């Protein structure tokens, strides 16, 4: 729930940050956002130009809606586009227009059964058709300002759609203000906990949402905002940090290296573990992790055994190998992993004291409590100042269990088992020559 | 310093562009950017709406600051966030507010010792609390315009923060104008050369900077702008361009290929060489290269030997191999590498003359002086029109030194040594059968 803990494993040159809580996007909720349109001195010329801006944007969006919707072809906006193709049917936009008369928001059930939360964020019909057309003529300038303020959002929404080919992510305050999004969260069919979670992190909700331009028909401008559904909440999460583990023979080039490849975020999900290899897809609010299951791999509960016994036969833990013993560092949640090899100078420093630690050759770990920076040669690393408990788990480096002569130097996506039987066959290669003579 | 030179190596189907100068981001400098806030007819309704926009943005930012700061978890904004957590302490914002009374900028030493350059880019307190509140009432419209102009920056800064989850890069003119950034550069503790370098390339400084939303407390809106520190200046840089090198046996499929994998930018850094495999991370101002050391690999000075003797035993030069002899081209700083294999048509053309060169099978190189485009089958390549000297270094293609029968076809991240001993074992595999009979 809080109380971030972190364990570094001397044996595998890796660390695990535990104590986080999950918020996993497992589904999508489509909502329909609508703008109603009016079909139609220096005071008047300002109105002339501003009305030209209004209608130019409408025709611009009308050109954009011509059988457009698609992005990335990851089929992420597939759920939203499905609603869009339905909105293109005879009286479906009219249902939305009917419910939103003299209101800002409404629930509509399309003839497919899909209930959509609908919102009217701007009324240019009831402005142009009731205050602006009623007057080439004369006017007072503070109507020019008022028309510019209202028309601005339509122009800015057309701005985003044109440059993003009708689909935008993340969702801007132009597409949906905090007020409008918080209202939408309040009424979409989710747990009181899910509503609380989304409302406290609307910025993250924007990151994992889409705005899809749909249709301009019957004087309604409608676009679909595809909101995330977090169906997995409050389950344990943990992040795995990995760094190369090499031998430290004195002579340069005579060393063999090994690195765990399964780094990223892991979260419990219904008896299995969801793994997100691309830390891009996860957002962290200092004890809560929001991740998209689209880029997730569903793994057994036994994958955690790679943190306690990397040689267990129940799971085939993945590593890569090399014989390049370069010096590098990784910044974890509560500290830093420092892989110092060869002649390189590696240090940890406090901004007020200077160097308070010099690392020896090998893989080591320091916490962030009294350290500000870490230097590995020509690179300067800054540590996070998150608060937690840091643990060091003693153990023999597993790179010492391998014979350098039979060790597979180049393996990019191997594993403990695959490396072993690769070694077995190379041991058999020498062996059948060991009894001929 | 200038005078870009470029050498193409016939032996390894690669080229090196020398003569560039370095500007390497090795550290960060955190500065604090502040906005002071006021705590609180058709003329008045415009003020009403514009004041609603003002306070809605404040509450929007207040919702965003709730234990937020993090992005990417590369720990890039770690230094800036460390200042942010300090600004959350009892009288630390008050120190910033005290120094910035009746001024635009000031140096503040926080109680941690960290001296921060502080700037006040907008004063909405001394506007709302002195000209706007002094008047529901009456007014003259040119106060409506004036309030809209001042409030715009606050609204636009809230615009960026909401869609980027409180951390934005690159840094916009909304976060920090050229005037404000140039002033900040002038006073941050760097060499006169570093100040000159940053001030002539503020656009690049923006590319390698972060703006972090921090806190709204005690009527101050503060965000941290994390400016780059270029601790390595004016050292030689060079870019390596690589293209496949294949044999040219007549029969399709009977050929073996080879490609150097170490392409990217290289720069001298304190007795070693900094390598940036992701040319994304480097920005080039036609003889000056700005690179971030976060994505850098620190390599020995001997790595350059791969450009003069790819078979040297001092460095294990990296290659990948294949038996697919497809035709492809690479556009270098001063020309183009053309790998033409099989039946494909490869040409270089001048926009006024047409085809002035037809390439034969193999790897070749042409300069950009009198060539405008290069065609390799169905692809059209345009060459840069940078000026320099282009050199062709004769040499036997190293792919001809390999026997196709023992040649490892699929190696993705191999090296000269790893390929050799892979060949040795496969030669031993045939050999022990060569003396049984």
């Amino acid at each position, epitope marked *: 729930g809080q109380n971030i803990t972190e364990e570094f494993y001397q044996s595998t040159c890796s660390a695990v940050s535990k104590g986080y809580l999950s918020a996993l996007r497992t589904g999508w909720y489509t909502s329909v956002i609508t703008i109603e349109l009016s079909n139609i001195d220096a005071k008047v010329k300002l109105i002339k130009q501003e009305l030209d801006k209004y209608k130019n944007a409408v025709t611009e969006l009308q050109l954009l809606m011509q059988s457009t919707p698609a992005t990335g072809s990851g089929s992420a906006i597939a759920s939203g586009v499905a609603v869009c193709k339905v909105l293109h049917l005879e009286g479906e936009v009219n249902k939305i227009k009917s419910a939103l008369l003299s209101t800002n928001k409404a629930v509509v059930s399309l003839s497919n059964g899909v209930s959509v939360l609908t919102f009217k964020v701007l009324d240019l019909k009831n402005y142009i058709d009731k205050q602006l057309l009623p007057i080439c003529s004369i006017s007072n300038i503070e109507t020019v300002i008022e028309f510019q303020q209202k028309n601005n959002r339509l122009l800015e929404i057309t701005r985003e759609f044109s440059v993003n080919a009708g689909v935008t992510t993340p969702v801007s305050t132009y597409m949906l203000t905090n007020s409008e999004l918080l209202s939408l969260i309040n009424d979409m069919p989710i747990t009181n906990d899910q509503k609380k979670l989304m409302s406290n992190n609307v910025q993250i909700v924007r990151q994992q949402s889409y705005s899809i331009m749909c249709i301009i028909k019957e004087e309604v401008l409608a676009y679909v905002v595809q909101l995330p559904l977090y169906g997995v909440i409050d389950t344990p999460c943990w992040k795995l940090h990995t760094s190369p583990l090499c031998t430290t023979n004195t002579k340069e080039g005579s060393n063999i290296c090994l690195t765990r490849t399964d780094r990223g975020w892991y979260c419990d999900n219904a008896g299995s573990v969801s793994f997100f290899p691309q830390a891009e897809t996860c957002k962290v609010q200092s004890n809560r992790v929001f991740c998209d299951t689209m880029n997730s791999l569903t793994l057994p509960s036994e994958v955690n055994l790679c943190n306690v016994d990397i040689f267990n036969p129940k799971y085939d833990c993945k590593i890569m190998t090399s014989k390049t013993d370069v010096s590098s560092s990784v910044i974890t949640s509560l500290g830093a992993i420092v892989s110092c090899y060869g002649k390189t100078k590696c240090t940890a420093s406090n901004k007020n004291r200077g160097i308070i630690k010099t690392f020896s050759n090998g893989c*080591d770990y*320091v*916490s962030n409590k009294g350290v500000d920076t870490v230097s590995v040669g020509n690179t300067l690393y800054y540590v996070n100042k998150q608060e937690g*408990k*840091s*643990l060091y788990v003693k153990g023999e480096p597993i790179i010492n269990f391998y014979d350098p002569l039979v060790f597979p130097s180049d393996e990019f996506d191997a594993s403990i088992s695959q490396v072993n039987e690769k070694i077995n066959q190379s041991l058999a290669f020498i062996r059948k020559s060991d009894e001929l003579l | 310093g200038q005078n870009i030179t470029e050498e193409f190596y016939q032996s390894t189907c690669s080229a090196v562009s020398k003569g560039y100068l370095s500007a390497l981001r090795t550290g960060w400098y955190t500065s604090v950017i502040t906005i002071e806030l006021s705590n609180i007819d058709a003329k008045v309704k415009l003020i009403k709406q514009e004041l609603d926009k003002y306070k809605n943005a404040v509450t929007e930012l207040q919702l965003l600051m709730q234990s937020t700061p993090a992005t990417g978890s590369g720990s890039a904004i770690a230094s800036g966030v460390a200042v942010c957590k300090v600004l959350h302490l*009892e009288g630390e914002v008050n120190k910033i507010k005290s120094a910035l009374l009746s001024t635009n900028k000031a140096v503040v*030493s926080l*109680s941690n010792g960290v001296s921060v350059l502080t700037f006040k880019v907008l004063d909405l307190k001394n506007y709302i609390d002195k000209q706007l509140l002094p008047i529901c009432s009456i007014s003259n419209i040119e106060t409506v315009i004036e309030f809209q102009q001042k409030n715009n920056r606050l609204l636009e800064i809230t615009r960026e923060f909401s869609v980027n989850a409180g951390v934005t890069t690159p840094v916009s003119t909304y976060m920090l104008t050229n005037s404000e950034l140039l002033s900040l550069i002038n006073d941050m503790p760097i060499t006169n050369d570093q100040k000159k370098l940053m001030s002539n390339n503020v656009q690049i400084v923006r590319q390698q900077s972060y703006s972090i939303m921090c806190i709204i407390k005690e009527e101050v809106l503060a965000y941290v702008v994390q400016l780059p520190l270029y601790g390595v200046i004016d050292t030689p840089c060079w870019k390596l361009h690589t293209s496949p090198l294949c044999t040219t046996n007549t029969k399709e499929g009977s050929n073996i290929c080879l490609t150097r994998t170490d392409r990217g930018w290289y720069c001298d850094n304190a007795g070693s060489v900094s390598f940036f495999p992701q040319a994304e991370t480097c920005k080039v101002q036609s003889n000056r290269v700005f690179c971030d050391t976060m994505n850098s690999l620190t390599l020995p000075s001997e790595v350059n030997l791969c450009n003069v003797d790819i078979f040297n035993p001092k460095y294990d030069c990296k290659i990948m191999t294949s038996k697919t002899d497809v035709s492809s081209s690479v556009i270098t700083s001063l020309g183009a590498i053309v790998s033409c294999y099989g039946k494909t048509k490869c040409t270089a053309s001048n926009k006024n003359r047409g085809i002035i060169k037809t390439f034969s099978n193999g790897c070749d190189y042409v300069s950009n002086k009198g060539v405008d485009t290069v065609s390799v089958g169905n692809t059209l390549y345009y060459v840069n029109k940078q000026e320099g000297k282009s050199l062709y270094v004769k040499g036997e293609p190293i792919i001809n030194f390999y026997d196709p029968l023992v040649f490892p076809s699929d190696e993705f991240d191999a090296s000269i040594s790893q390929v050799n001993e892979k060949i040795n074992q496969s030669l031993a595999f045939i050999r022990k059968s060569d003396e049984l009979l």
Partner: antibody
Amino acid sequence: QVQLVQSGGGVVQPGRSLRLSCAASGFSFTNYGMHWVRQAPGKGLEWVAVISYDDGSDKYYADSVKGRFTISRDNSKNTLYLQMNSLRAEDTAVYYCVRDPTGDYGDFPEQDGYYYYYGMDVWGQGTTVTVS
Amino acid sequence: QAVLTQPPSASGTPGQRVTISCSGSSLNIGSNYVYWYQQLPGTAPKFLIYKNNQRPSGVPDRFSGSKSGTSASLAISGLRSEDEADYYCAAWDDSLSGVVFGGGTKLTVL
């Protein structure tokens, strides 16, 4: 039964040397840093030295004793030492042995990779040293 | 000369709150955590406050701590007779490389 028991008290000659001992019982001594703290007659507390956890890599002294005093630990004997050299009249004080929590605030100790000051939770009852 | 400055004496009647101040520099208190100790007469110091505001197990609620910029203070609410003791603040100092103590505060209970 967390317990620190000190021994080694007595009078000495200026310019001579003298050692102190505090034997830990009731907890895993290896996993915690340890402090030496004195209190001169009628004066306040003065921090003397600290030893890092398990291996003592990091070991810091005050300038009042720098270059003359030395700290060391025997994890097998669960016992802490203070090497006092070149004793002077100003060193005359009651000497205390203290465990540094090293993370254990009621849960478990941590391993930061360097010395960090978590406080001073378990104290010996003190021993008396007089230089005359 | 007691790198951390705190008042020499304090006095109080039962039920009162006494407040003991402790002022340092950017290099000791402004940068690091502050810890408080209580030393009854003839006894060893007792661990009282850690990380500027945390009670160790078995320390009553009426003791509270706080830190402000470069200075810290300890609030002994509901003053009781046995609270009569010397109170010391302490923190890690980065200008040196060791722990620094306050001057002590002889607190008398009436």
